[PDB]
Structure formats: structure tokens, C-alpha cells
């Protein structure tokens, strides 16, 4: 029950896949999921940042942007789908070093949470030692995670145990349902 153990201030980053496999409506459903989560946790001790990744990495908004403009529709208005590869290792290192920074609104007393949303196996390699103080929850969606073997490639990015921190969805429509399952775990 590690998700139920989180208490107090939480700095949560969405790391979302903008790879070439995604159809326009699928990309939009990822955006809507992030908006739904932010709206439901509005006015709690949560604050949010969001990073799109594909071949390279872009901070769509920093924690300090969220604090000023606490409006999910406005914060994500300008997102452009990158349509390239899936460099997940680099992306996690980007979040750990470029996003969780006090200069950008990160709080020193906040538990660090990373929700990763992806529709494919990573196209890079490396390590994520830099993320060892981040709780990592990964959502893998769609046909590229049909096989058990592909599902297990995500375990190396997630916190342990995989049974808690790796969620496989067969379609993008299940994101709405996942949202509901997650609210019951998160204490506010």
C-alpha cells in the first residue's frame, strides 16, 4: 500500500509519451487524463508539473507555472505532439534533474511522485539512479503491451513492487476508469 502511505505535500510530475505511434485522439485522451487528475486534486497539498517526451524532452509547465495559473485547461493549451521516438530513460533523468528544482517551484518537504504514461517500449538505454528518491508509477497502454515480455520491460522504470506500480491498460478508453481507481488510493 505505498500509494496509501503518501501524506503531506506532494510534488507530482506527469511524464507523457508523445511518440509517433499515438493517434490524435489517443494523445488527446492522455491530456484529458492529466487534466482530470489535476482538477480533482485542486486545492489539496498537491502541485503539478508536466513533461512531454519522445526523442527529446519538453517541460510543458513547471511547478511555479501551476501555482500562478492553477488552471489545467490553460496550462496544457499549447502542447504540440512531438511524433518521434520513446527515450524513456533520458526522460526520467530529465525529470529528476530539470523539473524537481527548488528554483522552479519544487518544495523541499514534498514527496516526489512521477506518473509516466507511455504506449511503447523505450528506445534508449541507461540507468535512472538519479530518480531513486522519486516514487515512480507507470501506465502502459495499448497494442504494444500485448505480450508479457513487453509489459515486463516497464518494471525497470517503476518503483517496487511492479504489482503496485505498473498498470497495463489495453485501450486508451480505460484511462477514465483508472482515474477512479487512483482517487481511492490517494489520501488528501
26 binds Mg ion (CB under 5 A): no
19 binds Mg ion (CB under 5 A): yes
147, 120 in Cβ contact below 8 A? no
Q: Which of 3, 9, 21, 123 binds Mg ion (CB under 5 A)?
A: 21
From 18-26, 29-37, 98-106, 153-161, span contacting Mg ion (CB under 5 A): 18-26
36, 179 in Cβ contact below 8 A? yes
- Name residues whose C-beta falls within 8 Å of residue 16's C-beta, 6 or more positions apart in sequence: 30, 31, 34, 50, 51, 52, 53, 116, 117, 118
SS3 state at 133 = coil
90 binds Mg ion (CB under 5 A): no
From 15-23, 52-60, 109-117, 121-129, span contacting Mg ion (CB under 5 A): 15-23
Cell (9 digits) for 86:
520513446
18 binds Mg ion (CB under 5 A): no
Least distance in angstroms from the C-beta of 20 to Mg ion: 7
From 19-27, 31-39, 61-69, 89-97, span contacting Mg ion (CB under 5 A): 19-27
Least distance in angstroms from the C-beta of 60 to Mg ion: 18
Interactions with Mg ion, residue window 98-127 (CB under 5 A): 119-120
Least distance in angstroms from the C-beta of 82 to Mg ion: 11
The runs of H, that is alpha helices, within the chain are: 2-5, 24-40, 63-68, 72-75, 88-94, 148-152, 162-165, 174-183
Cα–Cα distance between 166 and 160 in angstroms, integer? Answer: 9
Least distance in angstroms from the C-beta of 8 to Mg ion: 35
Least distance in angstroms from the C-beta of 120 to Mg ion: 3
116, 93 in Cβ contact below 8 A? no
Size of the site for Mg ion (CB under 5 A): 4
> Which spans of this chain sit near Mg ion (rule: CB under 5 A)?
19, 21, 119-120
Amino acid at each position: 500500500g505505498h500509494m496509501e502511505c503518501i501524506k503531506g505535500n506532494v510534488d507530482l510530475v506527469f511524464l507523457f509519451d508523445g511518440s509517433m505511434s499515438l493517434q490524435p485522439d489517443e494523445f488527446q485522451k492522455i491530456l484529458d487524463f492529466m487534466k482530470d487528475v489535476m482538477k480533482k486534486l485542486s486545492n489539496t497539498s498537491y502541485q503539478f508539473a508536466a513533461v512531454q517526451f519522445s526523442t527529446s524532452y519538453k517541460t510543458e509547465f513547471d511547478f511555479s507555472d501551476y501555482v500562478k495559473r492553477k488552471d489545467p485547461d490553460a496550462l496544457l493549451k499549447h502542447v504540440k505532439h512531438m511524433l518521434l521516438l520513446t527515450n524513456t530513460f533520458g526522460a526520467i533523468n530529465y525529470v529528476a534533474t530539470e523539473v524537481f528544482r527548488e528554483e522552479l517551484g519544487a518544495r523541499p518537504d514534498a514527496t516526489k511522485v512521477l506518473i509516466i504514461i507511455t504506449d511503447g517500449e523505450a528506445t534508449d538505454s541507461g540507468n535512472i539512479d538519479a530518480a531513486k528518491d522519486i516514487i515512480r508509477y507507470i501506465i502502459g497502454i495499448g497494442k504494444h503491451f500485448q505480450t508479457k515480455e513487453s509489459q515486463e520491460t516497464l518494471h525497470k522504470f517503476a518503483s517496487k513492487p511492479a504489482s503496485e506500480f505498473v498498470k497495463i491498460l489495453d485501450t486508451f478508453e480505460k484511462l477514465k476508469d483508472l482515474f477512479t481507481e487512483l482517487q481511492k488510493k490517494i489520501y488528501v
